Design an enzyme around this catalytic site. Structure first.
Site, PDB file in Angstrom:
ATOM      1  N   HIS B  39       7.597   1.043  -0.490  1.00  0.00           N
ATOM      2  CA  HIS B  39       6.688   0.312   0.449  1.00  0.00           C
ATOM      3  C   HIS B  39       5.516  -0.484  -0.517  1.00  0.00           C
ATOM      4  O   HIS B  39       5.139  -1.773   0.063  1.00  0.00           O
ATOM      5  CB  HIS B  39       5.601   1.613   1.136  1.00  0.00           C
ATOM      6  CG  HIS B  39       4.313   1.032   1.899  1.00  0.00           C
ATOM      7  ND1 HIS B  39       4.330   0.396   2.586  1.00  0.00           N
ATOM      8  CD2 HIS B  39       3.283   1.518   1.336  1.00  0.00           C
ATOM      9  CE1 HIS B  39       2.987   0.126   2.997  1.00  0.00           C
ATOM     10  NE2 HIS B  39       2.302   0.838   2.357  1.00  0.00           N
ATOM     11  N   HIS B  63      -2.938  -0.115  -2.864  1.00  0.00           N
ATOM     12  CA  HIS B  63      -3.711  -0.153  -1.823  1.00  0.00           C
ATOM     13  C   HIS B  63      -3.762   1.310  -1.330  1.00  0.00           C
ATOM     14  O   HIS B  63      -4.673   1.825  -0.806  1.00  0.00           O
ATOM     15  CB  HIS B  63      -3.332  -1.220  -0.734  1.00  0.00           C
ATOM     16  CG  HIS B  63      -1.980  -0.778   0.224  1.00  0.00           C
ATOM     17  ND1 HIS B  63      -1.040  -1.048  -0.402  1.00  0.00           N
ATOM     18  CD2 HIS B  63      -1.911   0.049   1.025  1.00  0.00           C
ATOM     19  CE1 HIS B  63       0.020  -0.548   0.458  1.00  0.00           C
ATOM     20  NE2 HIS B  63      -0.687   0.061   1.456  1.00  0.00           N
ATOM     21  N   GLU B  67      -6.371   6.896  -1.950  1.00  0.00           N
ATOM     22  CA  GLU B  67      -6.116   7.725  -0.711  1.00  0.00           C
ATOM     23  C   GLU B  67      -5.073   8.777  -1.193  1.00  0.00           C
ATOM     24  O   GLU B  67      -5.200  10.230  -0.668  1.00  0.00           O
ATOM     25  CB  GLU B  67      -5.593   6.884   0.576  1.00  0.00           C
ATOM     26  CG  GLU B  67      -6.544   6.122   1.094  1.00  0.00           C
ATOM     27  CD  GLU B  67      -6.333   5.695   2.857  1.00  0.00           C
ATOM     28  OE1 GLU B  67      -5.146   6.244   3.113  1.00  0.00           O
ATOM     29  OE2 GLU B  67      -7.018   5.194   3.278  1.00  0.00           O
ATOM     30  N   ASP B  68      -3.860   8.353  -1.750  1.00  0.00           N
ATOM     31  CA  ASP B  68      -2.793   9.379  -1.713  1.00  0.00           C
ATOM     32  C   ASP B  68      -2.567  10.023  -3.058  1.00  0.00           C
ATOM     33  O   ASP B  68      -1.861  10.848  -3.505  1.00  0.00           O
ATOM     34  CB  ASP B  68      -1.535   8.743  -1.401  1.00  0.00           C
ATOM     35  CG  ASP B  68      -1.352   8.410   0.019  1.00  0.00           C
ATOM     36  OD1 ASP B  68      -0.431   7.324   0.533  1.00  0.00           O
ATOM     37  OD2 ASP B  68      -2.036   8.761   0.898  1.00  0.00           O
ATOM     38  N   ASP B 124       0.257  -4.824   4.332  1.00  0.00           N
ATOM     39  CA  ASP B 124       0.542  -3.088   4.759  1.00  0.00           C
ATOM     40  C   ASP B 124       0.992  -2.839   6.023  1.00  0.00           C
ATOM     41  O   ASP B 124       2.010  -2.243   6.194  1.00  0.00           O
ATOM     42  CB  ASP B 124      -0.838  -2.495   4.209  1.00  0.00           C
ATOM     43  CG  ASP B 124      -1.013  -0.791   4.592  1.00  0.00           C
ATOM     44  OD1 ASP B 124      -1.925  -0.393   4.548  1.00  0.00           O
ATOM     45  OD2 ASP B 124       0.217  -0.432   4.186  1.00  0.00           O
TER      46      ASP B 124
END
Ligand SMILES: [Mn+2]
Ligand SMILES: [Mn+2]
Lengths: 187, 187
Positions: B39, B63, B67-68, B124
């Site tokens: 991705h 990006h 978050e991850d 994205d």
């Protein structure tokens, strides 16, 4: 910067990312200012999304390296860094009157005994088709001024590639989209 | 392994390729065995094809990193390796009842003063939409079993994102394709 245990795309893939970007750093997508690495990253992504192995994703990153960035000396570097299986996919992907050269390459793909070559090739062509479609939306028929063949010749060649990918069991996720784009760009 | 002179995508971009792949090595696209790096490579490619700067392409690779893959400690590493401009794009991209959270994020994008955020965000979302479309061609409506929202909620959210990207002058090459995919996946 922990190295996870036996990830599918690991140290050699990361080395290939850097090698591809360094090797193609000065190359641009034809007719543009767009760095060529964008194409290689896109092809590697598509191959990975089709369940490609690390060898196959690396071959995707490197599929234009022999043609565009140094021929047999670059192939030897690929062997040294990434092994002979990667090198053999790259070489088999690599490519007299134009129409006979196209026919020879189509028959070369048709006769291939390496499913990895079909996966890499079809991902390459899918990205090229998406790129034509996107460029059409920005510059219209000016996109055709970047090619060394007519629109009719280009559509014929992609149609023949699609037929080969179907007969060689390329992933349907790729050939379904190819067929849609070809119809779209054919007007 | 020559380093070309002042390439658009150079040493820092190559470091970001490796950092993104190492950081996300064990992450998979939701519901699949597909390495998540696919991705990030796809988004970086799209940003580059839209004429993105090195800072913007790097932010694309990173990006999802806060978050991850580690929150504020990872943001600090991004600052150390890639600088505060990259970190600020990543943080502004990063994200109570579900529908109010979605509305808050939409308004956050709408009010952004950073065009780089709009470029990264739209790339994205374009990749996510292409991925839904491709998955639909393989597994049909089973694709919807991977989400934490209904098909109707997901289509609404993408439609609202598209409207924001248009008003914030995201590249037309991206929004034209988004609109086509949204219509396709909406049946
Ligand atoms: Mn290629
Ligand atoms: Mn993302």
């Amino acid at each position: 910067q922990v190295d996870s245990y036996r990830p599918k795309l690991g140290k050699k893939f990361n080395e290939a990312l850097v090698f591809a970007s360094e090797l193609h750093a000065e190359q641009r997508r034809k007719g543009t200012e767009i760095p060529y690495i964008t194409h290689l990253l896109a092809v590697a992504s598509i191959i990975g999304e089709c369940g490609g192995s690390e060898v196959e994703v690396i071959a995707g990153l490197l599929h234009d390296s022999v043609e565009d960035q140094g021929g047999q000396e670059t192939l030897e570097i690929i062997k040294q860094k990434f092994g002979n299986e990667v090198a053999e996919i790259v070489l088999e992907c690599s490519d007299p009157p134009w129409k006979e050269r196209k026919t020879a390459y189509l028959n070369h793909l048709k006769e291939s005994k390496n499913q990895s070559v079909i996966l890499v090739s079809s991902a390459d062509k899918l990205h090229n088709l998406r790129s034509i479609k996107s460029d059409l939306s920005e510059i219209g028929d000016l996109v055709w001024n970047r090619f060394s063949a007519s629109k009719e010749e280009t559509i014929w060649y992609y149609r023949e590639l699609l037929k080969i990918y179907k007969v060689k069991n390329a992933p349907k996720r790729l050939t379904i989209e190819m067929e849609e784009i070809i119809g779209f760009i054919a007007k």
